[PDB]
Amino acid sequence: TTCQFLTKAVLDNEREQLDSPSARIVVGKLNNVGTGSFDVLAKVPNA
Amino acid sequence: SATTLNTPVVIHATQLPQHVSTDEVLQFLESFIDEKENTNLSSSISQLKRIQRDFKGLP
Amino acid sequence: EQSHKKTKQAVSYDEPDEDEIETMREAE
Amino acid sequence: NENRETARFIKKHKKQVTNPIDEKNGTSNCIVRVPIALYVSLAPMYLENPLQGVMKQHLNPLVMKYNNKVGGVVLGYEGLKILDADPLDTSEKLIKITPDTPFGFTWCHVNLYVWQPQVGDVLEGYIFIQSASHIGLLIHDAFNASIKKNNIPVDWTFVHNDVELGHWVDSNGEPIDGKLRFTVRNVHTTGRVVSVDGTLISYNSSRSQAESLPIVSNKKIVFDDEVSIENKESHKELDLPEVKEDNGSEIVYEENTSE
Amino acid sequence: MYKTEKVDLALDPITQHFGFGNDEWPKEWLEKLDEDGLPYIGTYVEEGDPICAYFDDTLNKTKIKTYHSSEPAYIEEVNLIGDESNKFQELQTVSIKYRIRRTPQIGDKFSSRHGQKGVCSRKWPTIDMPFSETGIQPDIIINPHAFPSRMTIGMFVESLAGKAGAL
Amino acid sequence: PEDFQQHEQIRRKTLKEKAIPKDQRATTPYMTKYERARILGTRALQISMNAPVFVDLEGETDPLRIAMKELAEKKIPLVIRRYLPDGSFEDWSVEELIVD
Amino acid sequence: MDISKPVGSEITSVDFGILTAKEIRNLSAKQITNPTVLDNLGHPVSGGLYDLALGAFLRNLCSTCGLDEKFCPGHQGHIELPVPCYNPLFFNQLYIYLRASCLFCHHFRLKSVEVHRYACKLRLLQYGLIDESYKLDEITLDISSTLLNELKSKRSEYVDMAIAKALSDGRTTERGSFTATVNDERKKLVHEFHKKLLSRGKCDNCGMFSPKFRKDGFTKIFETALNEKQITNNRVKGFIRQDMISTYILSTEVKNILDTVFRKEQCVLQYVFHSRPNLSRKLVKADSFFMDVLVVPPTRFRLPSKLGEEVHENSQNQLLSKVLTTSLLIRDLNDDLSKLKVSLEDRRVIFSRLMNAFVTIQNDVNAFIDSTKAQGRTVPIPGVKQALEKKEGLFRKHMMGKRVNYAARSVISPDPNIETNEIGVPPVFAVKLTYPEPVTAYNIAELRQAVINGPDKWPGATQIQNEDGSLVSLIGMSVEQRKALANQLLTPSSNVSTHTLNKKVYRHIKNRDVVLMNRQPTLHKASMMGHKVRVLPNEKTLRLHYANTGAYNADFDGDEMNMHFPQNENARAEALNLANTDSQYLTPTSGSPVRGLIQDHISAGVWLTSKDSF
Amino acid sequence: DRLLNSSDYTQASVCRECGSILTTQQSVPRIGSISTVCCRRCSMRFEDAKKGEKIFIDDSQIWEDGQGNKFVGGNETTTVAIPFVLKYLDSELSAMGIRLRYNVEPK
Amino acid sequence: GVHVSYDNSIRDADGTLVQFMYGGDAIDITKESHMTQFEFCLDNYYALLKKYNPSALIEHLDVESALKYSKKTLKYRKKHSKEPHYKQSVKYDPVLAKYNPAKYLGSVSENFQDKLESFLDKNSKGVNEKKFRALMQLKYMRSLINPGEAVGIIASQSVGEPSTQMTLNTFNVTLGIPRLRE
Ligand SMILES: [Zn+2]
Ligand SMILES: [Zn+2]
Ligand SMILES: [Zn+2]
């Protein structure tokens, strides 16, 4: 019931926080499970 | 031309622009030209040398 | 019957078109 | 609410810091120092030398070119500082890498020295060329400036040079000197090189709604010359189809009948 | 494997005609089709090759009906049928039979008369094949681990019966 | 110019508030199967973009096998930002994390 | 996806809202007024569905961005509806608020103190505080206005204090806390509110009865006349008005009733329509439920479907053309209405002409949005709701699941000579499946050979990507050009804008690569493992070892398997260290093995390890 | 890699000011000028921009379309990597009168 | 969305807590096999001691905090052995509730603790009964479920995939898939 849940979302003026595997796939964001449960940062020497 | 590795994502003025005196501009130009002279940047230094020359002499 | 399933690249999980459809034929 | 919504737009186009005329020179100071914050990419080849990266990649192609955000021409940068992604004493900082690519992205702080010339600002330039319809100038012998025929005073009369070119004569009746003082009418950014449109002539001109009524004669000169420039340019690199009649004859388009 | 196709020109005035139109002729089509526009019986055809030729006056161009299949074929039979008319006779319907050769490939199923089917895993060389005391190498190899679950003992007695009857 | 300085102050304040100091960190001293996988993949990606390698690649052509060699000698210059369900994080270097 | 092309900006959250008519009119590239799509000769008609302002169409350049069919993203347009229409998706809601409101004082028929009680509870629920919403019901003092207004004051005082107290601590942010239990408590209240709203017959504010509204399957509302008991009630309560100073109802009348009600009851509706606090401070207007305009999607998403030779008209353009015909007709009816009038009396005809004009455009609007809300025409054309729910739906068929690039399918054949962690790849697949390998000093030798070898000799390369972003296909080229390009792979970039970048070689799948083997149905993650590529010459089938038979639940009875070739090192590392076969020895169901030898090997072992075997 | 990278991965222009992929368009430049990604929603019609003292537009804020109409503003556009179906979904939702606002960082 | 968080608890996609610990002990099923095979582990003591290399871990963990607490809980547990579950002491809760299993050697499930102690009593056998206890404590530490593991999908797959094997009919109460559907 895609249009029904969408109607309920619009009427609530809802913000999709994009934290569910499904939501992340919809917007092309990396899934927060496993390898997506952290961030990779590079150590740079120059100030 | 106009890529993430070429141009920045966002530029924001952290404070209002503070005006600088003729002597401060000339002191900065001399400091910048000397540091950069020490590939397409060379043509910009060539133009910068003309400004420095105008702020103290005649072309 | 198995020669057709052999080539079909599934959209999702099987399907509830059996007893499940008649069990889903009840409102809250 | 009627004027509250329009008030936000005025503050968006409001000139932050105005250029002041000082030291009885008559010219307005346009070189200004502005501290900024960048969000730049870092190439993996610059992972051992990140400051050289931010410089060669994004800050070097920025100099001697107009930047829309600072509202001027970046003359150079001073004091580059990478913001550490880790809030903490050492020179070893860390930058967040994109999940998809090996490239990292970081916040940077650098002070920019920019040439910020607003309209109404009085500037001086050395006359480069002088045609019958415009006068070419150079601000600090690096920035291009132009004064159109309509922006030149009515009293002024142009004279064409015979046997190697032309020269303009002022109201007094003498040729114009190497350096010329003008007011900024407009600044053209969109193009390749920054060009300043200047004026040599300058609200309460109404004589029973006379100011509102436009002089068609004067309004034509500024419109015809504008259209003539736009149409001549559109005719450059114009490919038209070759038409051959049902006889084997090519239709040649030429206004002049004889040679 | 034989496959038959019906090339009918129906989609009352006749527009499409079997053959080739004058003045217009795209390069090397005569290699597959004969003067009549129909293909030479025995010709090798691949997908994209012309299987027949015609000319329709509505477009005033010489068009062809292409052969399209992953498996290449040879023309076995071409039959022209000009029925459903009393005196006004002209061909519009043609039946073309394709002969597709099918050698046993890795994946093809083979079975004994005891319900023991199996896919061809490989075409094992005779030098690498196990050789009998008699000097015979088996045509087909069945794995012994097939029989304990299926319980196809009819095949086991068929093996010693077939051997006795061959000798 | 004035509205951005406040936004930057808030952004950096929230970042500092979420950062768990090196002493107060309480996650596993071991590098998770997922951390190892991403580190090796990301470092391989860096190696393929002509990034300065800290190991002697004796005829190695695969960037992943180079990234594997760099991991064995703990020369990978990466950090894992371990997030918690409230948004707070623990920064762990590849060097200090224990590898099986 | 290109590693040479990183992205600096990212979508952090998506906000759901309604497009306003004023908003659409400004962003619109062209106003669509014409029902025809093509002029004579074959050019798109100005003001039609194929207008070039909506994007490049029929080898013509776009009249908005100027780009051709490839680079033009397409542009949105708009249809000006001559009369407002009920939005099909939000009709049920506007209907609830129409039946719940008084037609005289233009407030909800429920008592203001009771309405405020819901507004209070819903405001406290914008923030994660359920306990406080229940504690509000404890606040208690035919009842005088001076007493009831003190109750509204004390309740508002508790709401403002409870929010500030929780805001002081880390209990709730300025944007408000939102959990599933919080959502459960909100959903319960918004339901209870509408139930209490619909239940009241006689208005609790002003004691006058309102005429009941009835509805049909299609978006259309009627007004049932009041009974003699309620008509006499209006008369006796008619004098108190002075001291203070079934029939079809048009869309405009409903919009005008809801306009005043949404203004007068703005306080409660502010929290009824906002899940979290309304920081944007936007007004909750009734015109959100109505459509005064229709957005025309870009020509890009309304292209005519071509099947072989026949070029078929796009179904959306057909539905949109119908809306355009009706709009032109009502513009004429309103023009004739504007002409004449002194002569009237029989005004039953002018309303009958109006009812037809309204019900016809409404149906055309409905037919375009949701077909199962439009009248039967002697299978109908699918609406945009039908497009999102065709079978499994756009979300299930094209978002949660997708057809992919760099993938192959083949019948599996057994093989005991390959490793248990390997897959036998036919040379057919090996010459087509390529990996974007960036050229460096450590692999210049390996890739130079691949480039020379080309796209038909394994291990080769099908293409080469320069640092400028362009592609050079090696398919048509002979050994001579390939040799020249190979000696140009490690050349330094002259351009400073691409000095960071290095060339890429789209090299054939080698024996060091990872592949994702899949055997459907994928009932458990062991049915999708990472295998090491082993290109086996003169092969036409995928070769698989017997140890993999269990996990995939694959028997070599003519079964088929999918091979996926991931195109980046992060995806490689994952298929080699997480989803790889060797890390799937034990199933997570019982922690027992799903890998081992199956038949000949078991019988061989009993014989080989026997005492008699020397 | 499967559901995005090797399927419908598209680097699309988005306006940071209103959060949309469908209002952004490439501006039509003059003979010497360069084309810039501009938002049709946030940009104001040049003529409508009317005026404490008079203010002047910095030239870099004025862009033109194929129809020849001048616009002021709508230059706060960036690039985001998204699936193409999202663009088709947003387009379909827009027909229904539903607006999706994509909050894009950095701002 | 349900997965293992870095705080060892089972959290949903939106951060809402589902479980405080995976199965109440945080063990990966693909590791919980030889964890009770004490005789096996004893016969392969030096092989496993070299596998679970403790020399590069002794500086990162605690060796007494949890071990002391484990005795205090065992003390109160033995005191109310014959007593019913409602009358049982609530003074000291399990060692896993107070000490992180990946940081404290000894924060083991009471089920594992009871099983391990019972083995050392019923089997008197150059490996000491105290150094073997440490190895098994270390084996449990190395058998923990990794933070990030999609325990949600894994659970549904672990209930779904084997429920295909019960499609066949009865050979009174509802069984197989119809009962699972109920
Ligand atoms: Zn366009
Ligand atoms: Zn009332
Ligand atoms: Zn915008």
XYZ file of N, CA and C in Angstrom, chain I residues 21-131:
333
model
N 21.479 -7.880 25.076
C 22.572 -8.772 24.674
C 22.023 -9.929 23.847
N 22.749 -10.308 22.773
C 22.382 -11.399 21.871
C 22.299 -12.711 22.640
N 21.090 -13.273 22.706
C 20.796 -14.504 23.436
C 21.169 -14.481 24.910
N 21.483 -13.288 25.420
C 21.887 -13.049 26.801
C 23.340 -13.368 27.105
N 24.156 -13.643 26.058
C 25.565 -13.997 26.239
C 26.500 -13.410 25.168
N 25.937 -12.838 24.075
C 26.625 -12.188 22.944
C 27.514 -13.156 22.125
N 27.137 -14.442 22.032
C 27.942 -15.418 21.285
C 27.441 -15.588 19.836
N 28.393 -15.636 18.881
C 28.139 -15.901 17.465
C 27.899 -17.406 17.334
N 26.754 -17.817 16.752
C 26.366 -19.234 16.606
C 27.424 -20.021 15.804
N 28.034 -19.369 14.801
C 29.075 -19.931 13.939
C 30.416 -20.118 14.711
N 30.402 -19.921 16.050
C 31.551 -20.060 16.951
C 31.245 -20.978 18.145
N 29.978 -21.001 18.585
C 29.469 -21.793 19.708
C 29.317 -23.282 19.297
N 30.446 -24.006 19.183
C 30.407 -25.425 18.822
C 31.347 -26.209 19.727
N 32.647 -25.861 19.721
C 33.643 -26.527 20.556
C 33.822 -25.795 21.896
N 32.989 -24.766 22.139
C 32.993 -23.955 23.355
C 32.586 -24.772 24.611
N 31.959 -25.947 24.418
C 31.579 -26.881 25.486
C 32.356 -28.186 25.314
N 33.072 -28.331 24.175
C 33.908 -29.492 23.865
C 35.245 -29.318 24.610
N 35.173 -29.376 25.955
C 36.284 -29.163 26.881
C 37.389 -30.196 26.713
N 37.037 -31.493 26.566
C 38.030 -32.551 26.360
C 38.820 -32.282 25.075
N 38.124 -31.873 23.986
C 38.742 -31.524 22.703
C 39.756 -30.391 22.900
N 39.303 -29.288 23.526
C 40.097 -28.099 23.824
C 41.302 -28.437 24.699
N 41.147 -29.397 25.632
C 42.227 -29.836 26.517
C 43.300 -30.590 25.728
N 42.881 -31.518 24.835
C 43.774 -32.313 23.981
C 44.523 -31.429 22.977
N 43.972 -30.235 22.693
C 44.534 -29.255 21.770
C 44.805 -27.931 22.489
N 45.251 -27.996 23.764
C 45.532 -26.819 24.591
C 46.552 -25.887 23.927
N 47.769 -26.387 23.666
C 48.869 -25.607 23.101
C 48.575 -25.136 21.669
N 47.773 -25.907 20.909
C 47.372 -25.548 19.548
C 46.423 -24.349 19.571
N 45.453 -24.356 20.508
C 44.470 -23.287 20.663
C 45.065 -22.073 21.381
N 46.025 -22.289 22.307
C 46.721 -21.222 23.039
C 47.550 -20.381 22.060
N 48.053 -21.024 20.988
C 48.810 -20.378 19.920
C 47.842 -19.680 18.957
N 46.613 -20.233 18.801
C 45.545 -19.683 17.956
C 45.044 -18.380 18.594
N 44.485 -18.474 19.820
C 43.974 -17.344 20.596
C 45.136 -16.638 21.311
N 46.154 -16.158 20.543
C 47.376 -15.488 21.027
C 47.060 -14.426 22.110
N 47.350 -14.724 23.403
C 46.987 -13.781 24.472
C 48.036 -12.700 24.744
N 49.294 -12.904 24.287
C 50.435 -11.993 24.455
C 50.154 -10.576 23.918
N 49.348 -10.470 22.844
C 48.971 -9.202 22.218
C 47.582 -8.721 22.700
N 47.106 -9.248 23.850
C 45.792 -8.908 24.397
C 45.831 -8.592 25.913
N 46.766 -9.206 26.674
C 46.923 -9.054 28.137
C 46.978 -7.573 28.615
N 47.461 -6.651 27.760
C 47.576 -5.219 28.059
C 46.264 -4.451 27.769
N 45.349 -5.052 26.984
C 44.078 -4.442 26.586
C 42.875 -4.873 27.440
N 42.996 -5.967 28.214
C 41.876 -6.452 29.024
C 42.162 -6.450 30.538
N 41.115 -6.772 31.321
C 41.112 -6.912 32.776
C 41.041 -8.406 33.093
N 41.869 -8.876 34.035
C 41.967 -10.302 34.360
C 41.325 -10.643 35.732
N 40.868 -9.646 36.525
C 40.328 -9.986 37.844
C 38.911 -9.458 38.140
N 38.591 -8.193 37.774
C 37.302 -7.537 38.054
C 36.094 -8.472 37.889
N 35.935 -9.075 36.691
C 34.840 -9.985 36.353
C 34.953 -11.323 37.085
N 36.186 -11.871 37.206
C 36.455 -13.148 37.879
C 36.070 -13.112 39.358
N 36.300 -11.970 40.035
C 35.927 -11.791 41.438
C 34.402 -11.754 41.551
N 33.746 -10.942 40.691
C 32.292 -10.786 40.646
C 31.600 -12.127 40.366
N 32.152 -12.944 39.430
C 31.644 -14.276 39.062
C 31.524 -15.202 40.273
N 32.429 -15.051 41.256
C 32.414 -15.844 42.480
C 31.291 -15.374 43.410
N 31.071 -14.039 43.495
C 30.033 -13.432 44.333
C 28.634 -13.848 43.877
N 28.418 -13.960 42.549
C 27.133 -14.374 41.973
C 26.920 -15.869 42.174
N 28.009 -16.663 42.085
C 27.990 -18.110 42.286
C 27.671 -18.432 43.752
N 28.143 -17.568 44.680
C 27.924 -17.674 46.123
C 26.428 -17.567 46.449
N 25.757 -16.491 45.981
C 24.330 -16.246 46.221
C 23.433 -17.216 45.451
N 23.927 -17.763 44.325
C 23.196 -18.725 43.500
C 23.093 -20.070 44.217
N 24.199 -20.504 44.861
C 24.283 -21.761 45.608
C 23.483 -21.692 46.917
N 23.344 -20.478 47.495
C 22.603 -20.226 48.734
C 21.104 -20.464 48.557
N 20.555 -20.106 47.378
C 19.127 -20.236 47.079
C 18.880 -21.266 45.955
N 19.599 -22.406 46.000
C 19.477 -23.500 45.027
C 18.102 -24.174 45.105
N 17.702 -24.608 46.320
C 16.431 -25.287 46.586
C 15.251 -24.300 46.566
N 15.519 -22.999 46.835
C 14.533 -21.908 46.856
C 13.885 -21.691 45.468
N 12.601 -21.251 45.376
C 11.996 -21.049 44.047
C 12.475 -19.751 43.391
N 12.196 -19.589 42.079
C 12.625 -18.449 41.263
C 12.121 -17.084 41.780
N 10.904 -17.018 42.359
C 10.339 -15.768 42.876
C 11.002 -15.341 44.205
N 11.506 -16.310 44.995
C 12.152 -16.070 46.291
C 13.692 -15.914 46.174
N 14.256 -16.113 44.959
C 15.695 -16.009 44.677
C 16.229 -14.594 44.933
N 17.506 -14.502 45.375
C 18.198 -13.242 45.679
C 18.385 -12.385 44.422
N 18.190 -11.070 44.572
C 18.336 -10.107 43.480
C 19.455 -9.097 43.819
N 20.322 -9.447 44.804
C 21.451 -8.626 45.252
C 22.434 -8.402 44.105
N 23.055 -9.491 43.619
C 24.020 -9.456 42.527
C 23.410 -10.064 41.270
N 23.344 -9.266 40.194
C 22.816 -9.700 38.902
C 23.979 -10.342 38.086
N 23.752 -10.988 36.905
C 24.865 -11.662 36.200
C 26.087 -10.793 35.899
N 27.269 -11.443 35.801
C 28.569 -10.811 35.524
C 28.570 -10.135 34.126
N 27.761 -10.648 33.174
C 27.660 -10.083 31.829
C 26.888 -8.764 31.825
N 26.021 -8.556 32.831
C 25.229 -7.337 32.967
C 26.082 -6.176 33.483
N 27.188 -6.486 34.197
C 28.069 -5.491 34.811
C 29.426 -5.327 34.108
N 29.918 -6.353 33.386
C 31.229 -6.262 32.737
C 31.183 -6.665 31.266
N 31.767 -5.814 30.393
C 31.847 -6.004 28.941
C 32.613 -7.301 28.610
N 31.968 -8.269 27.909
C 32.636 -9.553 27.620
C 33.938 -9.466 26.822
N 34.097 -8.441 25.967
C 35.294 -8.248 25.147
C 36.418 -7.497 25.894
N 36.151 -6.993 27.115
C 37.147 -6.238 27.885
C 37.515 -6.891 29.219
N 36.636 -7.738 29.766
C 36.870 -8.362 31.063
C 36.891 -9.878 30.939
N 38.050 -10.497 31.247
C 38.204 -11.951 31.224
C 37.457 -12.514 32.426
N 36.412 -13.284 32.154
C 35.577 -13.861 33.197
C 34.108 -13.524 33.061
N 33.772 -12.411 32.357
C 32.375 -12.027 32.102
C 31.858 -12.953 31.001
N 31.395 -14.099 31.473
C 30.939 -15.265 30.749
C 29.497 -15.564 31.196
N 28.699 -16.260 30.356
C 27.327 -16.618 30.730
C 27.356 -17.623 31.873
N 26.406 -17.509 32.817
C 26.335 -18.406 33.972
C 26.164 -19.866 33.534
N 25.563 -20.090 32.345
C 25.387 -21.401 31.723
C 26.774 -21.986 31.389
N 27.647 -21.174 30.742
C 29.023 -21.549 30.393
C 29.840 -21.751 31.662
N 29.682 -20.846 32.656
C 30.388 -20.889 33.940
C 30.104 -22.209 34.660
N 28.809 -22.572 34.800
C 28.359 -23.808 35.446
C 28.916 -25.041 34.732
N 28.852 -25.061 33.385
C 29.336 -26.160 32.544
C 30.854 -26.338 32.648
N 31.620 -25.222 32.640
C 33.088 -25.234 32.717
C 33.562 -25.714 34.083
N 32.976 -25.178 35.170
C 33.325 -25.550 36.542
C 33.018 -27.023 36.807
N 31.895 -27.533 36.255
C 31.476 -28.931 36.385
C 32.475 -29.879 35.713
N 33.088 -29.450 34.589
C 34.075 -30.252 33.866
C 35.356 -30.408 34.687
N 35.840 -29.308 35.290
C 37.067 -29.276 36.091
C 36.931 -30.099 37.383
N 35.695 -30.266 37.890
C 35.430 -31.050 39.092
C 35.348 -32.541 38.758
N 34.546 -32.894 37.736
C 34.317 -34.273 37.297
C 35.506 -34.880 36.509
N 36.539 -34.076 36.156
C 37.693 -34.575 35.400
C 39.026 -34.037 35.938
N 39.711 -34.858 36.753
C 41.024 -34.546 37.320
C 42.109 -35.257 36.489
N 42.847 -34.474 35.671
C 43.888 -34.967 34.760
C 45.192 -34.186 34.936
N 51.332 -30.857 30.138
C 51.378 -30.230 31.453
C 50.444 -29.042 31.577
N 49.130 -29.322 31.666
C 48.079 -28.305 31.762
C 47.412 -28.374 33.141
N 47.415 -27.243 33.869
C 46.768 -27.100 35.175
C 45.280 -26.813 34.986
N 44.471 -27.062 36.028
C 43.025 -26.819 35.993
C 42.706 -25.313 35.988
N 43.679 -24.476 36.397
C 43.550 -23.019 36.472
C 43.925 -22.359 35.138
N 44.966 -22.876 34.445
C 45.408 -22.331 33.155
C 44.444 -22.741 32.019
